[PDB]
Symmetry: C2
Subunit: 269 residues, 2 copies
């Protein structure tokens, strides 16, 4: 058998590898290289530009935390926007909420959506939901052009934050993927720096997920209210949320309790 | 340059790799292969039987959490035992407490201790402390033979738990390294199973550490009291603890807030 290996100048000096059971699909889209494979122990894997986007084994950690954090804080969210997230995982998580009336997603590369609809049916199933509307578009162009404002914006990717701010309702929230605390602390500082210019409450949380570099990924959290995103305003008690595998009431708050070295870094910002 | 790669049947299908700046030392001791190298981005690395034991970049996460969890719960700990932990990291953390009168460590393989004294001076520095006593011995033999009982036992390695129980004071605590929740859940269930036979409060916590498989490692926590190990009984406010980099009052409790799928597994135990 053969091994997939993940290298990048964003994390030099380290790599993470998964054994390939069999390659399933492979292409060069207009935007990036796309690879799909069955791994031997992590299920199916989606790779974009040689970097793991998701695996079946652990994707719930990232998609549940990214979604249910802001969605339990938002009181009655009606209009939600996903930026990036062609795979549909966040969308699967959003559809669980009955009060949501619309879900927009802006993903630049439709191959990602199409590949995920084909190979990852337990991830991309929210696309069959009538509330969902897909926009094959540059997020920066979508945000400049949009007429609705949103209750929650989830940035599942990677002046921009000026656009996010203007696209949110006066009490709206944004959560964006934001680096591993183990590798890019200067970047975490910069992102928090930018967001604090605009948002009155910027907070950083951490997700345990083995197939992202360093085994974790952070969530930049932006509120317009004084209150912020650390305390849920509801429990996910209905039948739709019975099968959640990572997120729960308590770990919501826990995820914001950061290593001392990080607190020390993000204090004088 | 060349790459070190970490394979094992304990986590098949995955591997983690670090770029080698230069190999520093390499031997086959009576017990295991020992490798030391400077990596390009994680500092010096200690490898035992081809599995990473520690790196300079992130070792504090594991050593601080393993130590300061039970040591902030124990009221006035006087006698402490480390099993394994030849590297000295836990010992460095223990020496910070002024009330501790003795620190015993039982490590079967003195090469580990000697190599760490040479190559990892900011890790093995607690050995120069007068309270520390080294026992080149099999832990199971040490525990059967010991006449003192201990306030805290820290198992920095990997009937045994019957021996740990008997070696602890009536109100003593044990913390043992206990698997990643991402890979060996059956094992976590078994360890908790064994410990609950003996200890009245068994609890599992999670440490974020990038160079262990899956980027995290758990702490099996065993108390004889009803109270347990989730709530510190003190704050580490003195000059000795000013330089802590991971552990703090809040993340102590947070580390016990586990992913829903794990709670579901360890409930009917």
């Amino acid at each position: 058998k053969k091994w997939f290996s993940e290298f990048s100048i964003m994390w030099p000096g380290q790599a993470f590898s998964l054994k390939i059971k069999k390659i399933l699909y492979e292409t060069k889209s207009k935007y990036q290289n796309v690879l799909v494979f069955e791994s031997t122990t992590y299920g199916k894997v989606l790779v974009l530009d040689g970097v793991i986007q998701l695996t079946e084994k652990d994707e719930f950690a990232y998609h549940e935390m990214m979604t249910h954090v802001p969605m339990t804080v938002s009181k009655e969210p009606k209009n939600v926007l996903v930026v990036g997230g062609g795979d549909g995982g966040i969308i699967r998580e959003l559809c669980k909420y009955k009060s949501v009336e619309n879900i927009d997603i802006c993903e630049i590369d439709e191959t990602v959506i199409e590949v995920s609809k084909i190979y990852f049916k337990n991830i991309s199933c929210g696309y069959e939901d009538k509330r969902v509307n897909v926009f094959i578009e540059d997020a920066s162009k979508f945000l400049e052009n949009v007429t609705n404002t949103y209750d929650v914006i989830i940035v599942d990717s990677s002046n921009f934050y000026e656009k996010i701010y203007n696209a949110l309702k006066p009490n709206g929230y944004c959560v964006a993927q934001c680096e591993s605390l183990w590798i890019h602390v200067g970047t975490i500082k910069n992102m928090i720096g930018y967001a604090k210019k605009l948002f009155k409450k910027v907070e950083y949380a951490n997700i345990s997920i083995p197939t992202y570099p360093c085994g974790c990924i952070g969530i930049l959290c932006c509120s317009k209210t004084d209150t912020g995103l650390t305390k849920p305003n509801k429990k996910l008690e209905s039948k739709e949320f019975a099968d959640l595998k990572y997120y729960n009431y308590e770990n919501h708050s826990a995820a914001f309790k950061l290593p001392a070295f990080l607190l020390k870094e993000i204090e004088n910002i």
